[PDB]
Amino acid sequence: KRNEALRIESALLNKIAMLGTEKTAEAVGVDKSQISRWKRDWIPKFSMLLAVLEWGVVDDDMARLARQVAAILT
DNA sequence: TCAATCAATTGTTATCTAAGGAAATACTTACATATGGTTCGTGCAAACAAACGCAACGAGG
Incomplete structure (x- = not known):
């Protein structure tokens, strides 16, 4: 959960x-x-909550890769 | 026949220089109220930060 929080x-x-x-x-x-100031204070804490809460979302670079693949195949 | 001088008692002060050893622990007033300080999130203006556009300069041609 530590690396997911990061x-x-x-x-x-x-x-x-x-x-x-x-x-x-x-x-x-x-x-x-x-x-x-939220960026400095709470965003890390909310991020740890999300890591525990299991709300992680797809990284945008891999999102672009998937979009490109779906365009190339189709 | 009082007091200046001995004599026993009381109180104060003193007992070497360095290096190692770590300190400990019983002995429980409670419930309510006023106030006020501290923590926290916010807004506003100030203070930095990025990235250009223009003009002047000074080297290159």
Whole structure:
């Protein structure tokens, strides 16, 4: 669960970074500072919970690989 | 016939220099209320951070 927690934290932080701390705050309903500080404080803890809760999702690179394979075959 | 001087009792102070050895543990007021401090998540502005566009400069041709 340790490495799953690390993976989930990395995926979450990547999603926030891609969407944008400012944009993520605007969509969530908080201030950019709140997202910036959740990234430091709770995202690791929530990530460990997800690792235990077994909510891990497919890594996006392998997702792109699967999409490409499904396009090439079909 | 009082007091200056001996005499026994009481209290204070002293007993070498270094190196090793680690310390311990009984002896239980309780329930309620006011207040206030501390922790925590938030917002706002400030303070950094990335990545360009433009212009000036200074070397190359």
